[PDB]
C-alpha cells in the first residue's frame, strides 16, 4: 500500500531488471542463522508469543530496506510500497489458515492486533481467502512468512511459478530454536527475486530482524 | 502393493490441483541428524554405517505414507504401501545404482543390502536402475546419495521437466562431524509440495534420527 | 587452450546424455572452509582477505579439470585448460572484473588489486557478461563475495530451459567461529553434467588446503 509505479528511466536498478527479466527463474533464497537467545527468554517471562516476536522484527525489517518492498504487478509494472503487511499461515485444530497481519512501527499496537488476529480467526473464514484476494488484487503488498518452530533446518528451497516469473512476492521460513555454544539460534530463510534484491540488501535486513529481536526483549 | 487414489476422497485433493500448475512443486530441506551412538556402534560392529542410516531413512520412508505418493507415468497420483530405495555405489575408477528392498527387519535388510553392493555387475550403466525406473513409471522407490567425505550444509536438486520437476523424493547424506561433543551428519530431502508439506519432512527426520539410535 | 571434447570417447558420456533432457541439469552445494590461519595472516599483512579466497578458490578450479568443462554457444562440450575467475566489486553509489589465476600469490595479488583499481567509472555492471556471451566459450568461473552475511545455504538463477548456467557460479560469505576454529560458507554452482560430488570435496579440499598455503 501507500504505492508508487516507478519511473525505470531514472531508477538506479533499471539495467538489473531488464538483465533478470530474460530468465526463467530470476528468483533465489539464502537460509541465515538469528541469535534469538535474549528474545526466546524475553517472551517466555513475559507469557507472550516468541512467533510474534521474530514476526514483528522481520515485517518492521522489509519496511526498512526499500528494495525488499518492490514488486511486478499482475500487468508487468514495477511498483514500490511504502508499506508491505505480512502473511502468514497459522496452525489450525486437525491444517492451515493464513491471515494479513499490519505492520505499525510501535510493538505494543502490532503484538495486540496480531494476537487477536492469529487467536480469532473467523469460523467461516476461508483458510486461503487472504491469498486469493491478494492476488485477484495484484499488488503483492506483502511478505509471506511459514513457522516451522518444531524443524531444525540449514536450507529450504522454494517453488517455481512460472517461467519468467518465479514468485510474487518474498517467501520466508522460519525454524526450530536451537542452542549453540551457549547462544540460542534459529534458522531464517527468505527468497527474493534478484531484480529487486542483491546481497547487500539482505545483510541490511538480517541484521535488522537480529537488532529488532534484541530490541523489543529490554 | 500399488493404489490408484480416489483423488475425490483425498484431503490433498485441493493441493495437488493447486501445485500441477507450477514449473516446479518440489522443494528440498537439509538438516542435521545426530549419529553419535550410530557411528560409533557400527565400528564397533565391523559394520557399514552407510547401511545404518539407509535403513534409517528407507524405514523412515516407509512410515510417513506422504513419502509414497507419486505421480505416475500417466498423470495418475498413485499410494505404495512400500517403497524400495536406490543408491549410487562408488566404484573406484564412476558410480553404479543399486535398487535395494526395505524389510523392517533389521538384520534382513543389512545382509540382503550388503550382499547386493559387494556384487555389482562390473559393466553397468551408472544410470540403469533408473532407466528401468522410468520405463515402468510407477516410482516405487525413493533415491539416496552418500558424500560422506563432503560437509554441506546445503544441495539443491535438478528440474526434469517442467510441470513435473522430479518423479520420486531424492536424498543426500554428508559427512559426519563433530557439534559440541556429539556427532551429527547432514541430511537432505527433495520432495513434492503437491504431496508433502513440513510436518510430514519433521515426521521423517524424527524418525531417521530415532532409528539410527535403535539399531546401535 | 580450448579442446573440443570428443564425447565417444568421453568418460562421462552417460552422464551428458542422462542430463541433457532436463530443464534444468545445475545444482548447488554450500559447505564450510576453514580460514583460522589465512583470515589471520591477511590481518596481519593488512591485506585483503577477499583476494586471499579468491586466490584459492580459482586455484582450485584450475586443478580440477571437471570444473573446466563448458558447453559452448554452439552447443558443443569443451574443456578449457585455464579459466579466469570474474566477480563484481562494489563501486561507490558494482562493475564486474575478469582476474586470471596465476600461481605465484604474491603475483596474483598485486595483479588482482591492480585490475579492481582501474575500474572504468562508466563501466556497464554486465559487460563482462556481455563480452563472454558474445565469445562464448565461458573460460571463467564466477564468485560473489558477502564478507558481512552469514549463510547457510543460497540459491541460484535458472537462466534459460535445457540450459541452466554457462558457467560455475560461486558465493563466499561472512566467517564465523564454530568448535574453536573460524569458517566461512562457500557455495558453488555446477552442471550436474560435468561435476559430480567427488569434484567437489577435491575442489573444496583444495580451497582449504591453499588458504593455508598462502597464511604460510
Known amino acids: 500500500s501507500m504505492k508508487h509505479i516507478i519511473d525505470i528511466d531514472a531508477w538506479e536498478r533499471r ?3 531488464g538483465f ?8 533465489y533464497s539464502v537460509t541465515t542463522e538469528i541469535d534469538c537467545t535474549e528474545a526466546s527468554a524475553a517472551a517466555r517471562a513475559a507469557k507472550r508469543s516468541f512467533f510474534l516476536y521474530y514476526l514483528y522484527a522481520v515485517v518492521r525489517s522489509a ?9 511486478t504487478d499482475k500487468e508487468g ?16 485444530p486437525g491444517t492451515f489458515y493464513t491471515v494479513r497481519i499490519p505492520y505499525y512501527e510501535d510493538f505494543e499496537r502490532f503484538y495486540a492486533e496480531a494476537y487477536a488476529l492469529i487467536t480469532n480467526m473467523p469460523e467461516d473464514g ?6 486469493k484476494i491478494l492476488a485477484e488484487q495484484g499488488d503483492y503488498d506483502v511478505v509471506h512468512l511459514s513457522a ?19 514468485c510474487s512476492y518474498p517467501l520466508m521460513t522460519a525454524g526450530k530454536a536451537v542452542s549453540r555454544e551457549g547462544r540460542l539460534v534459529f534458522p531464517l530463510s527468505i527468497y527474493v527475486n534478484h531484480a529487486f534484491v542483491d546481497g547487500s540488501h539482505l545483510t541490511s535486513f538480517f541484521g535488522k530482524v537480529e537488532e529488532y529481536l534484541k530490541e523489543i526483549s529490554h
Open 20 to 27: 533478470f527479466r530474460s530468465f526463467v527463474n530470476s528468483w
Open 126 to 131: 476461508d483458510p486461503y481467502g487472504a491469498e
Open 148 to 166: 516451522v518452530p518444531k524443524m531444525y533446518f540449514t536450507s529450504i528451497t522454494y517453488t517455481l511459478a512460472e517461467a519468467g516469473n518465479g
Open 77 to 92: 509494472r514495477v511498483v514500490f510500497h511504502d508499506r508491505v503487511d505480512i502473511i502468514s499461515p497459522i496452525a489450525v
Open 63 to 71: 519496511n526498512e530496506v526499500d528494495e525488499l518492498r518492490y514488486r
Open 15 to 17: 539495467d538489473n531488471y
